Amino acid sequence: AYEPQYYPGNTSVAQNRRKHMSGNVEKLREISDEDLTAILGHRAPGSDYPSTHPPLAEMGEPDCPIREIVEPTPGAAAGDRIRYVQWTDSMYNAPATPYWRSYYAAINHRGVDPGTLSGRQIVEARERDVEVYGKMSIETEMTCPALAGLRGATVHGHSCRLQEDGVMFDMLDRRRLEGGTIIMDKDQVGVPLDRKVDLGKPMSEEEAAKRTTIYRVDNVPFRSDSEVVEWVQRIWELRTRYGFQPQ
Amino acid sequence: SDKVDIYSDRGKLLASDVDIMDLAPTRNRAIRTIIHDTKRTAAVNLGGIEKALANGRIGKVKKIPGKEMKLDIVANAERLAERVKELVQVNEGDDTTVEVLAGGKFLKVQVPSARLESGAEYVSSITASAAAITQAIIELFDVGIFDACMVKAAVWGDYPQTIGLNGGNVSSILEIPQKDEGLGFTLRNIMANHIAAITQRNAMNAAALSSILEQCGEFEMGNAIGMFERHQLLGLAYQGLNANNIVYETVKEQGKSGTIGTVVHSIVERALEDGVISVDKVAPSGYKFYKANDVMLWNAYAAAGSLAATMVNCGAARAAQCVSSTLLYFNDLLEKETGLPGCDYGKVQGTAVGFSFFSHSIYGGGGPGVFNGNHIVTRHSRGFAIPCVAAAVALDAGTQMFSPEMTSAVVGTVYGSIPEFREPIKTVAASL
Amino acid sequence: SDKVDIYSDRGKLLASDVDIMDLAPTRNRAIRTIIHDTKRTAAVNLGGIEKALANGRIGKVKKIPGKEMKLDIVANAERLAERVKELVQVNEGDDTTVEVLAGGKFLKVQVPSARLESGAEYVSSITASAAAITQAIIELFDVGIFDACMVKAAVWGDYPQTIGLNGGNVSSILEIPQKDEGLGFTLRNIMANHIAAITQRNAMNAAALSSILEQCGEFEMGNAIGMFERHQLLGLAYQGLNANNIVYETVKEQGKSGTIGTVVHSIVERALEDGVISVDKVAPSGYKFYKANDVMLWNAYAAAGSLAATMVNCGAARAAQCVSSTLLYFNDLLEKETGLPGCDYGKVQGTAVGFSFFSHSIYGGGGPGVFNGNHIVTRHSRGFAIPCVAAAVALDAGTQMFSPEMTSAVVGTVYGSIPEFREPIKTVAASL
Amino acid sequence: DREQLFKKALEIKFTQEWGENKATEVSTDITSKKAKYLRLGTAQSPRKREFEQYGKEIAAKRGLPGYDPKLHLGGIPLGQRQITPYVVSSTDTLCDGDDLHFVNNAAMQQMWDDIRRTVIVGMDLAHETLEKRLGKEVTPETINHYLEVLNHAMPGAAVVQEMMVETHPGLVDDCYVKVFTGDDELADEIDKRFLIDIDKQFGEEKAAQIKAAIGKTTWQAVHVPTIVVRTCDGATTSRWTAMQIGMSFIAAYRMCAGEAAVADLAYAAKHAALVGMGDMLPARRARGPNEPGGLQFGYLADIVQADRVTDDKVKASLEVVAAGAMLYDQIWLGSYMSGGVGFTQYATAAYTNNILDDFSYYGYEYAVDKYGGPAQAPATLETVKDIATETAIYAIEQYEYFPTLLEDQFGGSQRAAVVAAAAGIATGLATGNSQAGLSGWYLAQYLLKEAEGRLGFFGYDLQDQCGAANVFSYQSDEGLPLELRGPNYPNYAMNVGHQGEYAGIASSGHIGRGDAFVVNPLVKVAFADPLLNFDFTQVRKEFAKGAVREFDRCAGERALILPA
Amino acid sequence: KRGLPGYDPKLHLGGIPLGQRQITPYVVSSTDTLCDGDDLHFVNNAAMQQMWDDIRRTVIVGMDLAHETLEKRLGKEVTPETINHYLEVLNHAMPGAAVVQEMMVETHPGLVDDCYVKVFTGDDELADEIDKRFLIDIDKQFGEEKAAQIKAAIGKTTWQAVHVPTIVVRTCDGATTSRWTAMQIGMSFIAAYRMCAGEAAVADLAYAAKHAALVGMGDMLPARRARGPNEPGGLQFGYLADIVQADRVTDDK
Ligand code: F43
Ligand SMILES: C[C@@H](OP(=O)(O)O)[C@H](NC(=O)CCCCCCS)C(=O)O
Ligand SMILES: C[C@@H](OP(=O)(O)O)[C@H](NC(=O)CCCCCCS)C(=O)O
Ligand SMILES: O=S(=O)(O)CCS
Ligand SMILES: [K+]
Numbered sequence A: 001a002y003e004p005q006y007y008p009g010n011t012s013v014a015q016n017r018r019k020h021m022s023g024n025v026e027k028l029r030e031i032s033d034e035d036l037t038a039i040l041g042h043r044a045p046g047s048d049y050p051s052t053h054p055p056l057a058e059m060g061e062p063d064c065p066i067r068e069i070v071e072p073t074p075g076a077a078a079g080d081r082i083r084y085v086q087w088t089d090s091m092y093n094a095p096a097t098p099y100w101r102s103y104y105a106a107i108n109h110r111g112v113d114p115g116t117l118s119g120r121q122i123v124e125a126r127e128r129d130v131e132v133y134g135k136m137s138i139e140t141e142m143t144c145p146a147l148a149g150l151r152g153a154t155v156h157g158h159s160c161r162l163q164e165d166g167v168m169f170d171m172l173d174r175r176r177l178e179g180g181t182i183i184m185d186k187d188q189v190g191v192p193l194d195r196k197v198d199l200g201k202p203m204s205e206e207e208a209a210k211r212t213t214i215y216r217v218d219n220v221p222f223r224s225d226s227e228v229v230e231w232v233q234r235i236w237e238l239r240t241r242y243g244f245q246p247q
Numbered sequence B, C: 001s002d003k004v005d006i007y008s009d010r011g012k013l014l015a016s017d018v019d020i021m022d023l024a025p026t027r028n029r030a031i032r033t034i035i036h037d038t039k040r041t042a043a044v045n046l047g048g049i050e051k052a053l054a055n056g057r058i059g060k061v062k063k064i065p066g067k068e069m070k071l072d073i074v075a076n077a078e079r080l081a082e083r084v085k086e087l088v089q090v091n092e093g094d095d096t097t098v099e100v101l102a103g104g105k106f107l108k109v110q111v112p113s114a115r116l117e118s119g120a121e122y123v124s125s126i127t128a129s130a131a132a133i134t135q136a137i138i139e140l141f142d143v144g145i146f147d148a149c150m151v152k153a154a155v156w157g158d159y160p161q162t163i164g165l166n167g168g169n170v171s172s173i174l175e176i177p178q179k180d181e182g183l184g185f186t187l188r189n190i191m192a193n194h195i196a197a198i199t200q201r202n203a204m205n206a207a208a209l210s211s212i213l214e215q216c217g218e219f220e221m222g223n224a225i226g227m228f229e230r231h232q233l234l235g236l237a238y239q240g241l242n243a244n245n246i247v248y249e250t251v252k253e254q255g256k257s258g259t260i261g262t263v264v265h266s267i268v269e270r271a272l273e274d275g276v277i278s279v280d281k282v283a284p285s286g287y288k289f290y291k292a293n294d295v296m297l298w299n300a301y302a303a304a305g306s307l308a309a310t311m312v313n314c315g316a317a318r319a320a321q322c323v324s325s326t327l328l329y330f331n332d333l334l335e336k337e338t339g340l341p342g343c344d345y346g347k348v349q350g351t352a353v354g355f356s357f358f359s360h361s362i363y364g365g366g367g368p369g370v371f372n373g374n375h376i377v378t379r380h381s382r383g384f385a386i387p388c389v390a391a392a393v394a395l396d397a398g399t400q401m402f403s404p405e406m407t408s409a410v411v412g413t414v415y416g417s418i419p420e421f422r423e424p425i426k427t428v429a430a431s432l
Numbered sequence D: 001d002r003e004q005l006f007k008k009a010l011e012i013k014f015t016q017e018w019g020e021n022k023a024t025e026v027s028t029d030i031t032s033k034k035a036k037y038l039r040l041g042t043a044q045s046p047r048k049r050e051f052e053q054y055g056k057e058i059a060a061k062r063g064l065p066g067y068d069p070k071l072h073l074g075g076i077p078l079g080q081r082q083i084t085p086y087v088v089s090s091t092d093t094l095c096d097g098d099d100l101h102f103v104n105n106a107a108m109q110q111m112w113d114d115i116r117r118t119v120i121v122g123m124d125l126a127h128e129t130l131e132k133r134l135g136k137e138v139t140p141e142t143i144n145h146y147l148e149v150l151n152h153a154m155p156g157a158a159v160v161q162e163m164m165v166e167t168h169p170g171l172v173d174d175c176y177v178k179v180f181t182g183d184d185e186l187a188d189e190i191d192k193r194f195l196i197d198i199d200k201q202f203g204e205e206k207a208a209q210i211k212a213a214i215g216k217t218t219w220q221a222v223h224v225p226t227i228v229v230r231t232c233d234g235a236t237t238s239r240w241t242a243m244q245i246g247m248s249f250i251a252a253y254r255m256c257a258g259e260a261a262v263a264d265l266a267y268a269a270k271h272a273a274l275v276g277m278g279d280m281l282p283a284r285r286a287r288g289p290n291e292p293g294g295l296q297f298g299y300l301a302d303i304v305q306a307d308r309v310t311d312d313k314v315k316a317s318l319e320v321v322a323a324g325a326m327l328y329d330q331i332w333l334g335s336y337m338s339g340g341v342g343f344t345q346y347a348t349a350a351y352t353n354n355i356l357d358d359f360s361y362y363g364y365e366y367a368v369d370k371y372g373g374p375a376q377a378p379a380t381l382e383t384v385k386d387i388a389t390e391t392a393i394y395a396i397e398q399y400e401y402f403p404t405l406l407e408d409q410f411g412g413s414q415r416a417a418v419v420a421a422a423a424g425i426a427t428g429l430a431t432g433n434s435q436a437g438l439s440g441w442y443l444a445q446y447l448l449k450e451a452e453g454r455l456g457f458f459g460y461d462l463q464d465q466c467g468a469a470n471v472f473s474y475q476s477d478e479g480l481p482l483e484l485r486g487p488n489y490p491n492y493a494m495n496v497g498h499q500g501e502y503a504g505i506a507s508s509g510h511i512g513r514g515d516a517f518v519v520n521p522l523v524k525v526a527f528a529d530p531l532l533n534f535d536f537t538q539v540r541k542e543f544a545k546g547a548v549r550e551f552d553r554c555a556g557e558r559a560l561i562l563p564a
Numbered sequence E: 001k002r003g004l005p006g007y008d009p010k011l012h013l014g015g016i017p018l019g020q021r022q023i024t025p026y027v028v029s030s031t032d033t034l035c036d037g038d039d040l041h042f043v044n045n046a047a048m049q050q051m052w053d054d055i056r057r058t059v060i061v062g063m064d065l066a067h068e069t070l071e072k073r074l075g076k077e078v079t080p081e082t083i084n085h086y087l088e089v090l091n092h093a094m095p096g097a098a099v100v101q102e103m104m105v106e107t108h109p110g111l112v113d114d115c116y117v118k119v120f121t122g123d124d125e126l127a128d129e130i131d132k133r134f135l136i137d138i139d140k141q142f143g144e145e146k147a148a149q150i151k152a153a154i155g156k157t158t159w160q161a162v163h164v165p166t167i168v169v170r171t172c173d174g175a176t177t178s179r180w181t182a183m184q185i186g187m188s189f190i191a192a193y194r195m196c197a198g199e200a201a202v203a204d205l206a207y208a209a210k211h212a213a214l215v216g217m218g219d220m221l222p223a224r225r226a227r228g229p230n231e232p233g234g235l236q237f238g239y240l241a242d243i244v245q246a247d248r249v250t251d252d253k
Helices: A012-022 A033-040 A065-069 A074-078 A098-108 A127-139 A205-211 A226-244 B029-040 B046-055 B074-088 B113-117 B124-140 B148-156 B192-198 B203-221 B227-240 B246-254 B260-273 B295-317 B322-338 B343-357 B386-395 B409-416 B424-430 C029-040 C046-055 C074-088 C113-117 C124-140 C148-156 C192-198 C203-221 C227-240 C246-254 C260-273 C295-317 C322-338 C343-357 C386-395 C409-416 C424-430 D007-015 D046-062 D106-116 D124-134 D140-153 D204-214 D226-231 D236-252 D260-272 D297-303 D313-336 D344-348 D355-371 D381-401 D403-408 D412-431 D434-452 D462-471 D499-513 D521-526 D539-547 E046-056 E064-073 E080-093 E144-154 E166-171 E174-192 E200-212 E237-243
Strands: A082-089 A113-116 A121-126 A148-150 A175-178 A181-186 A192-200 B003-007 B013-019 B041-045 B097-101 B106-110 B277-282 B288-292 C003-007 C013-019 C041-045 C097-101 C106-110 C277-282 C288-292 D118-122 D176-181 D218-223 E058-062 E116-121 E158-163
Touching: A012 A098, A033 A127, A033 A192, A065 B203, A065 B246, A065 B295, A065 B386, A074 A121, A074 A127, A074 B295, A082 A098, A082 A127, A098 A113, A098 A121, A098 A127, A098 B260, A098 B322, A113 B322, A121 A127, A226 B343, A226 D381, A226 D434, A226 D462, B003 B227, B003 B424, B013 B424, B029 B041, B029 B113, B029 B203, B029 B424, B029 C113, B041 B046, B041 B124, B041 B409, B046 B074, B046 B106, B046 B124, B046 B148, B074 B097, B074 B106, B074 B124, B106 B124, B106 B409, B113 B124, B113 C029, B124 B148, B124 C203, B192 B203, B192 B386, B192 B409, B203 B227, B203 B246, B203 B295, B203 B386, B203 B424, B203 C124, B227 B246, B227 B295, B246 B260, B246 B295, B260 B277, B260 B295, B260 B322, B288 B295, B295 B322, B295 B343, B295 B386, B322 B343, B322 B386, B343 D462, C003 C227, C003 C424, C013 C424, C029 C041, C029 C113, C029 C203, C029 C424, C041 C046, C041 C124, C041 C409, C046 C074, C046 C106, C046 C124, C046 C148, C074 C097, C074 C106, C074 C124, C106 C124, C106 C409, C113 C124, C124 C148, C192 C203, C192 C386, C192 C409, C203 C227, C203 C246, C203 C295, C203 C386, C203 C424, C227 C246, C227 C295, C246 C260, C246 C295, C260 C277, C260 C295, C260 C322, C288 C295, C295 C322, C295 C343, C295 C386, C322 C343, C322 C386, D007 D403, D106 D118, D106 D226, D106 D313, D106 D539, D118 D124, D118 D236, D118 D521, D124 D236, D124 D260, D140 D176, D140 D236, D176 D521, D204 D521, D218 D236, D218 D521, D226 D236, D226 E166, D236 D260, D297 D313, D297 D499, D297 D521, D313 D344, D313 D355, D313 D412, D313 D499, D313 D539, D313 E166, D313 E174, D344 D412, D355 D381, D355 D412, D381 D403, D381 D412, D381 D434, D412 D434, D412 D499, D434 D462, D434 D499, E046 E058, E046 E166, E058 E064, E058 E174, E064 E174, E064 E200, E080 E116, E080 E174, E158 E174, E166 E174, E174 E200
Parallel strands: none
Antiparallel strands: A082 A121, A082 A148, A113 A121, A175 A181, A181 A192, B003 B013, B041 B106, B097 B106, B277 B288, C003 C013, C041 C106, C097 C106, C277 C288, D118 D218, D176 D218, E058 E158, E116 E158
């Protein structure tokens, strides 16, 4: 037996980082299957998932011992196209941080291709699998609909000052606070939708500060989580020493 | 001394109590024979020569009007193979071989050992083959003085205006020595697509052939001297040759519902059970910082884990692209879980960072299949990254544009016809 | 079938009725051993490493202040050689050798065959030696983590910022594969100064070693296939190995008062006497146009003549520079005297035209000693020009700035200590 | 309380109107996390309006369109967020970020041309050739005559043949040759018009250190015409130099104009006594010598000359960072290795708004107080851990205390380059060891990742995750002192936000020690020359001049041969 | 001005300046222009420098493999409308202007107005649907026989004739051209087809533009005269003949 520990630290930030890593995240809002498909912009809502169409020479399944013992995901078994879910998260205590959305995906979802950047975080996977991931990425506490936004392009905003209404700037205006709720009426690449998708209320400033995986000097300073600073120094020192002589 | 049991691509015992020193590129007979055949074997594309002649074409776009020659090359493949053998051989009955493949479209040429022994590199496999087919065609079709330069161009391409046989029809699993980034990189300049095609998309054999070639490269680079010989051989045995069945059994245990993260947890549990790591100290929060009781063996477990995670994650999606993120997050999460450095002390994770970038951006790279140990993006790890890329390419089910069927048809047919290349784990264990 | 008698550097019979096929790089055991030792032998400049460490210097001008580590290296050459042998060898009692030379300043390292058999090229001779001496020095002086990078720089130079060990202290008779102009040029990239230093300025042995290496290069390039095998072997035997004593006896006959022109007349007289050429037709003026009864044998007589003329002309002046004009005017005058093409059908004369220009102008090149078979100026002939350059360099009594004593002290000492390199004619004849 | 050095710049660029961005309506408080988004687009920016206007003229003239702000994704032009200017650090120049794009900045192009068009060629072996082969006497009189001939010939003018056609001197007036020597007796006899006087250019201690390293050797600092390297490439420079050196020796010493001894002078000038700016690159990113990829980090530190004229150690190191961030990220990675809009702001993060200055002065002041002074801290992992952690965490917190600072350096790679450069430079200056500084850089990168839960762009940290292990490795393609690393060091060959900062770290150990040079004393002396078009003592001031279209020493233009 | 001398006719050997023999002009063949030989030195002749820059700054990049990636890998439709929109975006982006990100700084269009992309195709049905502003019409530029010969050699394939800014190759080198071209082709496909701005399929478009569908002016040179692609040493003699266009407009062979 083995009980995963995930990450060091004892502050609310470290506790939230372990929640995102372990998948122990609270559900705070609901999105319908068709509204999720509409905002991802890969196919018409309600339509069946299209398949890949590879050349004749690649249709044959090879005799492979690994293919025989690794079960394909539902998306891989159906031959879905590879599609994506990309998020931008404010540095003003958006619950999510790019590395921790990638750790959440790597630990809790099969057959995923996560990518971490400062202003965007992506997960590519077989379309139906990426929608299962996408639903959890938007319904859970990993998202605040004001401090975060699905953006497959023109991502600028993670490090910008918030708007006067507390919403993170979006050059393409895909979602905004409209009459007491967050409305997303364009897909993740800015194409206007023929519907309004209601992403619900934003988190309060206090809730975001309590649920965030980002450290901030005016909330939970990075300097205050001694075990995390120690862990960094330990990895740096051991990598340095073993690079010279691995003993 | 370090001992291992070698297990097959299907998790069956092949050899027991094997000293890792006996698996070294410098000692193992099967690995030496693989390298010998890699250096002496070349592919002549007779179908390509026929089309180049018929259309006066050189490569993909160059065409010289008025130079067309309609010669039945493929229909005379056997006759040309016999003459090519006479020209490539040094003595009658020597170790030269010429085999007609793909219904007359290709010739597998294996130059005799004598050409490599009197040369400095492998390139006589290309030059003897190109000169032999050029001469054989000139003779068979009685090509005159004015037209022989078109036969020459159909075989050798733009050479010598280009450094190599650019746009020609003679190639190898290897690239010209001038393309090496540094010293000892020739055996590292082999596309992952070539490996997956050669090994018939068997992911274990793909990782094994790639690990053998990468570690032959690391040895030739001077990265396996002194204490580093043990370091690289432990990586070769545990990642490349399924030592103690760790790769296969981890993939089997995690194959139904596993993720990159559950593979991290399995590897930490196994390293602790085997005494490779132990708790160093417990922090006030309860987090356990671990210590490596054997640093090189811990590195080898992280290399085996990096491959097992690739097989579980790319295998589940049946999609090669997941390898770049798998190599990154398996090692990043391994460090966060234990407080110990990841595979190659951050260099597998670092390689995976740039590899992810250059397989998802405008700047260069491409799909996983185009990468290799000599590629500027993926050269950084000491042979522990490309074996995972080769396995990932093998596991793909139709997501790639630049697949092995597109880029590696000739190399796959020619080198894939050789058993030691198709089944490297079995061949290595049997030569002990 | 073509037979020859091989004569020594002093014109004495060594072997009779030798089939030229048995002198081929692909068949002759002595040539194969010379190439095997060329690829596996490297030089470690302990004197250079000592000064680099003491002054924090890398190459000729780079110096990093504050990095001085005045380690005592040269006086510890035997202890360091012992440790280098342990690190370079694969198994105890294998074919690895490490020898101290030049009073501790150099180590001759011969890596075991196993490193070449599991590598694609010769470069493990450099990388295993560089890694071995770096590790041995770190151990002997207990060099710490912060300072080991300066031991690394003292041995490997600017590598990997540079493609090779630029400004380092590990070198070979060969240059890195990335410097090859095309395919099969590695054995051609050897300075004429290196050959002359290795052969102790014995002009016959300098021409012989150069001819062997150049023809190994021509074979690896694909220029000795089919009918061209006979073509190159006749050139190797008559120009490189003093076949039928033509080179030595022509030089002896013309040594006291001969010129480039009298050597032309001697060669035409001999070719006519031996039945190699005959009168084809007589013009109205009485001028006789000759025909070649055996074109390849006529080419070989012109190659032998080109060398004999170099020895007579450069020997008389005791000045290497005369070789460029000798190769030009021996062949130009040979054509004007007979109406037949000169050596290599104009390519020795053509090589000599550019060689003369690039050894007497502002644009590049230098003295004869800097040229080689891979040099853009002198690569054009199929191995028939550089053997004459090596002999000319050997015959120089002190006119050159960039002499073998200036450019080839390391290589000359290391490879010159090996008998097969010093006495190649004797070694080749004895292996039959 | 220490007043952060960037606050003045943040007040100017965010709270004072620039163009018609209505800055006072966006926010007047540099600490406010909120701002009023006015979405002014193109209308707020005179610079974007200039580009839009030229785009209309171009489309009309060619019948094929070009620049059009409305072709931005969704038909939404740049400037939905407030468009702000940049203060070039250490200057009072305020400019648009477009004015710092290498294409739009002649000072930046001229900086690269002055490096590209330079090689250093020894004279001793050439003089020895003349003595040995011709029995010629070399004296200060023959050398001075040779230098007059050389400065006439080098730009492309004839000295031997009749009926030669020559370059227009007005197009090549940036081309010249100066000399320097470690032989003080010879230096006192060289014609002062051509001499780089080591005693005048460097302080007493540094001049002695240079002379001891150079010995009694003599060198030519050659600068071929900018128009030639622009028409051709960097690999032209050593060949162009050798041709005119050869002609000048022929004419000045009355040699035969083409004898065997001339080839020895050619081999000496092109290979044996040549000291270029960098060697060739491998096949994938193939280039000949004298290209940015071959320029070792220590060479860029020796080209820059701020340390020669200022005792402010941090300032001198950051002038190196500015030259390197521009050359390596904007020109090299952003054009030679990629292109398009490129990487202006990945580089400007390291030379604007006094931000890197604030972080570097903080770390260095902390180290001076704790360890005593420059080059006094022990070169150990304990010292690196202390200085780099202190400096990195201070820098991390500044982005959180100042939302305007975070919005200015909006990309994580910009924050990573600046946070880690400050940690590395403070560590290098304090220990006098640039390898200790490099170790500090990687520790700072790791701290930033865990602090913000993000680091740089997708592939930013390939070299940083490889980094800690490869600082002190002695393996074949891993080990190397930082001074000798460069853009061809494998881990460093691809990514922005590292190379220029590494040039500053390479300089830091040496600046801490008071060394005259970092890796090549010949390079240091060759660039200690006020006649060079670019002023290498004031890199940031020169970039600021180019930004406002006031840099007046741009070479290589063809106005003289074009219609008026 | 410098206090360091330059050109001086009296520094010619013996203090005897050029022109002891009569200095005569040259007639440029086929013209009535009479000029000094110095006016034909490449340094002093902007037409000569611009000829080399127009070659150096050009590469040809195929569209078929990129369109196939969009269709097969992403299930995106490629039509004449999407191609024409892509070409407008491409001619805005290629000189160094932004299309995806916010707060980008850009090249001054007035410095890069020589930069543009045109297209040509052997598919006549597609040629009739491409926006005429960007088309090189093979039927208009070549005679009936030559146009047929070109179309038969090219087949039903489409290509981009890219000309990056002269200021860029002058500041940098010829090996910059294919990379500069690929970066802005990649950005234009992202913007014109509304892809994710950085997904796995984007790397296939990069590999196609930089390697698989690239047709440069010449390949690299070996170590002694090392240079990357698009330098004069790599320019094959037949390529220079195909760059020159006098045979297309004169029957005088
Ligand atoms: C399409 C890519 C993927 C790729 O391969 N390159 C891109 C785009 C490319 C283009 C954008 C030009 C344009 O807008 O048309 C250029 C300028 C390169 C070029 N071709 O000239 C560039 N990036 Ni990018 N790129 C940058 C950056 C960034 C930051 C921006 C994050 C933010 O919050 O704004 C993120 C990476 C990250 O998250 O860490 C980023 C991503 C990306 N970068 C995403 C697009 C993101 C988006 O959809 O908005 N860049 C930076 O972090 C700052 C410097 C900036 C570069 C331009 C400059 O230096 O001035 C530019 C460098
Ligand atoms: C990877 C390699 O590209 P290829 O995979 O060979 O197409 C390489 N480009 C680069 O490294 C791009 C570097 C500059 C742009 C990225 C800055 S983070 C090159 O063109 O030689
Ligand atoms: C020979 C070679 O010079 P090196 O011998 O390598 O110095 C070469 N130069 C040239 O070929 C000069 C060609 C142009 C001048 C002569 C025109 S006839 C070069 O620089 O790479
Ligand atoms: O988004 S990417 O990190 O691939 C490129 C940033 S310029
Ligand atoms: K240029």
